[PDB]
Symmetry: C3
Subunit: 312 residues, 3 copies
């Protein structure tokens, strides 16, 4: 199609740059400058709004393209194959075209507000400058083709079930675990400390299982879950804690996402995460909160997941 | 006997409740409400007084019953068999009957002072309420049978060597290690942080080795060691640290306990604990004290254990 | 030779003491009293000056003697064989005789300033006192033989290369990593916290690989690298951080040391260190600094090592 043809031209312009980027650099776990959690949350919110508006089948296809790209990584910089680079870019271009321009620009603007002005020059300094310049000229041509195809209005929101078994169970989980939620330091930098002993390629294989799960999940359930997180961001207090009602709606929506893929897909995520998560990480997190509230939350989670399991 | 027959009736009333308690919940590592270390120490002291007064052969038998019960645990909640539930309850009833009523009530009163009033309702909320009520009615009938057999005066105290090789060596250990003892934060919540990567059932198998060791140990030596801890609690300062003299008496008494079982029984404890203790736990503890005082204490310990080893 | 013959007499006098010392005690990782980092750095500086003045072939031979001695360790206290004790003492005596008396006395004076006056008595208390006294009388006789052979003036400095590929690359590494260097707490006691789960004998086998590497490295390159550290100490600020220029000269000098042994010698060090370094140690260090500056330093290091690798 037009975007796919344009992605091939973009690859001609940009794959030399892609091969030189060191994708295994740990810097990409960090914020693009000083960490500003609530300012960053505004940018994530714009992304969540955009993802909720995007065509669910095109989001699926873009996830699938990234899964395939992970399988073709080679060499010391972690670069995917030329064909997969193009396949990812085409799929993302189709996603971009499925939402109105203002939603895309809102992401750009909100990310630019948290990005240190010196970040582009530092990134470019690690690669061949002419190749980066050629890649960017390629991007500018590509986005013109994307815009030609781009919708001018956003699709409406998802339907939200009420009183289903997961929703009822989520109320109980949320009441039991909100004290724990309120204890957690949502503004900490700890979430960007690296996983001890885990290479980027090993992390990527765990992320892959979540990408695969996303591609399998029900698109309407995913959309509704994104919408619930947008609501929740809007209701935070000064410490970043969402309201109790919005938390419960997040838990219900995520339970419905879990139940929209088979057990094996979810266990693949869990098992891959278990392989990369040092056992001191849960201990460190637990140690920062009230231990009674954490055990109350965990007991409630293990009860809730039985309701999800039955629905799944 | 009368208590054993009553324990069978108690089991008819209470085993349904036992099967539904989630014995693998980590909450039981935590204080029953907000941690109040010096108030809890008062409760532990009442337990120590009671244990020192109890019949050593009945304490032994109760330890043995728990060892046997650990072997029959099954199912997702960690419940022991019906037969072993009864065997534990009978053995504990005999222990209770071997001390005067006031010592038992002193434990109840001192634990009640640290227990949040909402704890019973939270526990009951996790199980079938009718079964918990039936279990408690069973307990009330059982305690009447126990009371009929209960002594009215406490048995006398233990015999204690003075100037034996272990006692002399304990003086040296204690002088070398009291600076370390004083450094430790006895009022911290860290001792209730869980063992990373270790399930409740794995921890239980390590605890089993200590229960086995207690069942083998000399009852008079155990009694004397309990009495030494009661005295040591009496002399604590405002930070919880006992006097140097009472510390030395504890070390001597514990050395005599160690030497009252064979080497293999003690090494079974050590090896099981090594299997559940993350190597960062000793480091974390060491990092909170003066490193010279910790090495002085450790060197003194490894000297002391040679005297214990020879006596053993 | 005269020093070797005298080392045999020293061994007759001191090996009984050596067998008694508990060389596996962790206390030797710690400062000899309260840690005083900048005062200790003055003593290290005197050792660096002395090492830079010492005969490089005799330093090599003394490193080799320690490598051999590690291989003959036996028994619970970690003592090397009698023959290797003598071989080490003779080799060290020859090193001492290769520098002027004032450089040796300067080390003694600067270490004595950081050593708590009670340290000698505590060490002696752990061994047979008569054997320690016999060993010290032996040392006093030995040092008289060493002095008879001792030079009266210091050998000259090393040649400092300029503009070689390693030096040019070190400029770039140093510019990129100086922000990280400035963040590190150089005055912390953390560097003397022990390695979790690693015995002294396991640590010793990792140190052995560095001793072997030192014995193989170019003596002039080692000398120049010592001299660069002496200069860097001279330019420290109140937090202990050397100047940017002296840091760059250290990096250049160390790169030349690395490139003066084959890759396999360096990888033997790395692999042995990987076997004794808990993966939480890099995380703990990373967590104390700016994560962007640490990743900038690391990316620059992995670029720099490619230049070293080509030269090597
Ligand atoms: C249902 C559900 O769960 O959905 C989930 C789905 C996902 C996908 C997983 C997900 C996500 C992530 C999302 C949405 C990411 C969105 C990314 C958007 C990127 C936008 C970009 C780069 C935009 C721009 C705009 C630019 C403009 C450049 C110029 O105008 C400038 C300034 C000046 C002009 O003179 C010239 C110009 C050159 C024209 C530019 O250069 O770039 C999320 C949040 O998890 C939700
Ligand atoms: C650790 C490791 O190894 O990770 C490996 C992981 C993988 C996945 C295997 C891998 C890979 C591939 C990767 C990451 C590819 C990333 C591609 C990103 C593509 C982004 C695109 C196209 C984004 C946009 C945004 C657009 C915006 C367009 C507009 O806003 C613009 C401007 C101006 C408006 O006026 C009009 C507009 C139209 C609204 C657009 O048109 O396009 C790799 C490299 O191997 C690394
Ligand atoms: C199209 C598109 O946009 O896709 C995007 C969609 C998203 C959603 C935005 C997105 C994402 C994120 C995704 C998918 C996240 C997935 C999360 C999965 C979580 C799974 C969990 C917690 C699983 C488990 C399993 C457990 C098991 C526990 C037990 O068995 C254990 C051990 C032992 C038993 O004795 C008891 C037991 C208790 C039974 C547990 O405790 O937990 C992504 C990547 O961006 C792609
Ligand atoms: C910086 C900042 O301020 O950020 C703010 C951002 C927000 C969004 C506003 C905000 C918030 C709210 C947040 C994060 C809420 C998070 C909720 C997470 C819910 C996750 C759920 C339910 C996941 C699961 C996984 C499940 C797995 C189930 C199974 O695998 C299990 C086990 C075992 C299998 O055998 C069977 C199975 C069924 C397969 C399940 O059943 O459920 C907050 C707090 O305000 C912070
Ligand atoms: C570009 C940029 O800046 O992006 C920014 C974007 C954001 C969104 C703003 C952002 C953010 C915030 C994020 C991701 C927050 C994530 C928070 C996660 C918190 C996780 C917690 C608490 C986990 C746990 C696990 C626990 C386990 C407890 C137990 O298992 C334990 C031990 C032992 C068992 O016996 C009992 C048990 C009870 C079961 C616990 O107790 O707690 C950030 C970082 O600012 C970056
Ligand atoms: C030598 C040596 O080392 O010994 C070691 C031995 C051990 C065993 C290992 C050891 C230990 C632990 C010990 C001793 C534990 C002791 C536990 C005691 C439990 C006591 C209980 C539950 C008592 C009560 C009392 C109750 C009263 C209820 C009522 O009166 C109430 C209010 C009102 C009435 O109207 C109705 C009523 C219903 C009548 C009740 O309901 O319960 C230790 C410390 O390590 C020392
Ligand atoms: C992680 C995991 O799996 O752990 C597993 C570990 C095990 C061991 C295998 C296991 C098990 C079994 C367990 C824990 C059993 C516990 C039993 C407790 C019994 C307690 C008893 C009888 C206590 C008392 C107290 C009494 C007090 C009586 C009086 O004070 C009363 C009232 C009133 C006074 O006026 C008169 C009095 C007479 C003075 C009494 O008469 O009796 C299980 C379940 O499998 C879990
Ligand atoms: C009837 C009744 O009431 O029973 C109750 C009685 C109690 C007492 C109240 C009770 C309890 C608690 C109990 C039993 C506690 C037991 C504690 C045991 C501690 C044992 C220790 C530290 C053992 C070791 C072994 C070590 C070995 C070290 C070395 O070998 C190593 C690696 C390598 C060699 O090269 C050098 C070495 C240096 C030689 C060491 O360093 O330490 C309980 C459970 O309540 C039951
Ligand atoms: C909250 C609060 O305030 O609490 C307060 C409570 C108190 C009680 C008042 C208090 C206090 C004092 C305390 C805790 C003192 C603790 C003393 C512990 C002593 C433990 C000893 C000796 C244990 C052992 C184990 C041994 C093992 C020996 C062997 O295995 C070894 C190695 C190797 C084998 O080959 C041979 C072997 C021979 C088998 C041994 O020889 O000895 C304090 C500080 O005031 C705090
Ligand atoms: C190029 C390269 O790689 O260099 C590296 C090489 C190394 C070797 C690895 C290295 C190193 C370490 C170095 C140099 C260590 C130096 C050690 C020196 C020790 C000196 C000693 C014990 C000196 C003395 C002096 C004493 C004097 C005693 C008396 O006078 C006193 C007071 C009073 C008189 O009345 C009696 C007396 C009895 C006469 C004594 O008793 O002891 C370094 C730094 O890494 C650099
Ligand atoms: C964990 C573990 O197991 O580690 C194992 C590691 C090994 C390596 C295997 C091992 C071993 C052996 C070891 C450590 C041996 C150490 C030997 C040290 C020797 C030091 C010597 C000779 C130092 C000096 C200093 C001198 C100074 C002389 C003068 O200044 C003096 C006074 C006075 C001036 O007026 C004149 C002077 C002339 C200037 C001198 O003449 O001599 C062991 C024991 O097995 C432990
Ligand atoms: C004669 C005399 O005086 O001798 C004395 C001389 C001295 C010098 C004073 C002395 C000393 C100290 C010495 C020798 C120190 C030696 C330091 C060596 C440092 C080596 C380092 C960091 C090596 C590496 C290797 C790495 C590998 C990384 C990778 O491969 C990895 C994993 C995976 C790939 O995919 C990518 C990769 C990135 C390629 C790395 O990242 O780092 C001593 C002991 O006193 C003796
Ligand atoms: C207390 C106090 O204040 O102390 C003050 C003390 C000072 C000295 C004044 C001071 C300072 C400065 C300091 C410490 C500087 C430290 C510099 C360290 C440089 C280390 C280097 C370059 C090491 C290496 C190792 C390399 C390995 C390369 C390879 O193995 C690699 C990877 C992979 C293989 O396949 C190939 C290979 C080629 C084999 C390499 O290429 O390089 C400061 C900060 O002021 C503090």
């Amino acid at each position: 199609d037009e975007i796919g043809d344009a992605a091939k031209k973009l690859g001609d312009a940009s794959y030399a740059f892609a091969k030189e980027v060191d994708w295994n650099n740990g810097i990409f776990l960090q914020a693009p400058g000083k960490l500003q959690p609530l300012e960053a949350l505004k940018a994530i919110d714009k992304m969540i709004v955009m993802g909720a508006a995007a065509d669910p089948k095109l989001l699926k296809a873009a996830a699938e393209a990234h899964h395939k790209a992970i399988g073709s990584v080679s060499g010391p910089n972690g670069v995917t194959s030329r064909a997969d680079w193009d396949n990812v870019n085409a799929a993302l271009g189709r996603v971009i075209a499925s939402v109105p321009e203002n939603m895309v620009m809102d992401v750009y603007d909100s990310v630019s507000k948290i990005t240190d002005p010196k970040v582009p020059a530092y990134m470019k300094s690690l690669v061949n400058g002419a190749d980066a310049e050629k890649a960017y000229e390629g991007f500018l041509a590509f986005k013109d083709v994307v815009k030609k195809s781009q919708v001018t209005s956003a699709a409406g929101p998802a339907t939200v079930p009420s009183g289903d078994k997961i929703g009822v169970a989520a109320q109980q989980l949320s009441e039991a675990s909100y004290p724990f939620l309120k204890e957690i330091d949502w503004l900490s930098d700890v979430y960007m400390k690296p996983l001890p002993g885990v290479s980027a390629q090993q992390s990527l294989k765990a992320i892959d299982k979540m990408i695969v799960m996303g591609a399998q999940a029900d698109g309407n359930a995913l959309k509704a879950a994104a919408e619930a997180h947008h609501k929740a961001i809007g209701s935070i207090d000064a410490t970043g804690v969402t309201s109790a009602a919005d938390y419960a709606a997040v838990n219900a929506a995520l339970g419905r996402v879990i139940a929209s893929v088979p057990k094996s897909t979810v266990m693949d995520v869990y098992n891959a995460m278990a392989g990369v998560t040092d056992t001191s990480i849960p201990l460190n997190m637990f140690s920062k909160v009230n231990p009674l509230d954490a055990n109350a939350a965990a007991k409630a989670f293990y009860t809730f997941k039985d309701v999800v399991q039955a629905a799944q």
